[PDB]
Design a protein around this ligand. Structure first.
Ligand SMILES: *B(*)CNC(=O)Cc1ccccc1
Ligand SMILES: [Mg+2]
Ligand SMILES: [Mg+2]
Length: 466
């Protein structure tokens, strides 16, 4: 029975899609610790987004399932009879899920506290983290896209997925020959527009490009939207997430009757304030809840914020340097052997990251008997599950197969790197597996990843639902 399985997995790895590819494959029955499969379990490989497994584990260890994040508004002193304060400070402390609406709720609190005029400047304070926005080796041609958003302590999160530091751009065709209409979303009056996009003849070719040219804050739109095309929308990153948080907050104060006479800028709360008057605050949901939209959709912004939050917890330094030492420690503390790990970021985006697959499986072991096991395993995408907040990055994979509704795993794909790692729970035993692929040159071996995962779910004692 165990011998049959071993051969099958051999055959699934004969796939011509894994040509020129090193491939780490490890499976461990978790109730015994018996190794069911190993091939190159100790080869170091880029993990892409599976690196998040490591980050998420550390965040629960260091910050707690119970941990929550805060944002505050501060003046040097409370307002008086005339309802005047000088400078105002929006201070964010690494909340990954802060909305425009939470900003509006805070704006109303500022109004309900009796401020009617900010006479000075409004300052965006994100100094709870350092201002290194990007990891060193992340690719500049990549910076305009959501998963590559700049990192900050004070970032406005968009939508129910809480994609941070981005705005939504919408492009609507007009009459043929006229400029397309461009809508910059949140970032209106913040980010510059360069619109060269035009409406083309009805049923012509869509050639629309939406860019943020490197090292600018300008949204350059080019190409031709067909008169009859549906409205196009895209999430693009902005430069300086906090500053936009600031912008959006002035707008909210205006909408809540509180006038600003000054400027909106980056600024830290001065040291020489004696006892700041906190005029408004917001608390995020708890980590265990935030884990869900982070892990299901693989949120890179969240990953890195989390790392910088670990560096604040273990050292009081919202820094990649400190947080990464933080994660390594936490994993070690977990009983994980971190010899093969090289940690260069929390999202997996960096090509300096390295893992081995024994290591990943190891992590899955330890995190499995952890006090916070259920909140951990509940954040993993569940194969074939159509509801986006259950399925996640596995929603439209392994449908109609024994894997559907059972296999919980994290995904991870970029050029030449793909990974799948997680649990196959079943009647037989709760299995834990890791599949990491490097070298391959065509499409990502998702078929292969699937084949294995589906075999395991059967080995564990599941049948395809029909
Ligand atoms: B974690 C699931 N995400 C992805 O597969 C997209 C991604 C993100 C970061 C690194 C590689 C791939
Ligand atoms: Mg605006
Ligand atoms: Mg089943």
């Amino acid at each position: 029975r165990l011998t049959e399985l071993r051969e099958d997995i051999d055959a699934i790895l004969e796939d011509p899609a894994l040509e020129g590819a090193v491939s780490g494959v490890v499976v461990v029955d978790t109730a015994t610790g018996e190794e069911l499969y190993s091939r190159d379990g100790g080869e170091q490989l880029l993990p892409a987004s599976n690196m998040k497994l490591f980050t998420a584990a550390a965040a629960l260890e260091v910050l707690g399932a119970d941990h929550s994040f805060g944002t505050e508004v501060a003046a040097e002193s409370a307002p008086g009879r005339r309802g005047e304060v000088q400078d105002l400070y929006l201070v964010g402390r690494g909340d990954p899920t802060l909305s425009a609406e939470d900003l509006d709720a805070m704006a109303a609190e500022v109004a309900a506290s009796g401020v009617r005029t900010v006479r000075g400047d409004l300052y965006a304070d994100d100094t709870w983290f350092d201002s290194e926005r990007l990891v060193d080796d992340w690719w500049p041609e990549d910076e305009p896209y959501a998963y590559s958003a700049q990192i900050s302590a004070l970032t406005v999160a968009h939508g129910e997925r809480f994609d941070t530091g981005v705005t939504e751009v919408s492009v609507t065709p007009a009459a043929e020959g006229e400029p397309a209409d461009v809508d910059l979303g949140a970032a209106e009056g913040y980010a510059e527009l360069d619109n060269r996009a035009v409406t083309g003849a009805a049923g012509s070719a869509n050639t629309l490009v939406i860019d943020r040219p490197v090292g600018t804050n300008t949204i350059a739109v080019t190409g031709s939207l067909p008169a009859d095309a549906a409205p196009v929308t895209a999430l693009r990153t902005v430069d300086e997430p906090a500053a936009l948080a600031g912008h959006l907050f002035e707008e909210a104060l205006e909408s809540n009757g509180v006038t600003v006479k000054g400027d909106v800028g980056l600024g830290g709360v001065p040291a020489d304030w004696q006892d700041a008057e906190v005029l408004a605050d917001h608390t995020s949901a708890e980590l265990s809840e935030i884990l869900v939209p982070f892990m299901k959709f693989s949120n890179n912004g969240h990953a890195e914020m989390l790392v910088k939050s670990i560096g604040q917890e273990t050292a009081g330094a919202g820094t990649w340097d400190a947080g990464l030492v933080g994660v390594e420690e936490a994993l070690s503390g977990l009983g994980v052997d971190t010899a093969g790990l090289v940690l260069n970021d929390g999202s997996g985006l960096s090509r300096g990251n390295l893992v081995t697959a024994d290591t990943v499986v190891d992590l899955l072991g330890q995190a499995g008997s952890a006090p916070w096991a259920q909140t951990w395993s509940a954040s993993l995408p569940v194969a074939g599950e159509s509801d986006p907040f259950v399925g996640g990055t596995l929603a439209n994979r392994m449908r109609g197969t024994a894997a559907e509704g059972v296999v919980e795993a994290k995904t991870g794909t970029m050029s030449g790197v793909s990974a799948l790692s997680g649990y196959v729970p079943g009647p037989e035993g709760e299995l834990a597996f890791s599949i990491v692929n490097n070298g391959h040159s065509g499409p990502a071996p998702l078929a292969v990843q699937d084949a294995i995962a589906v075999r395991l779910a059967e080995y564990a004692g599941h049948q395809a639902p029909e």
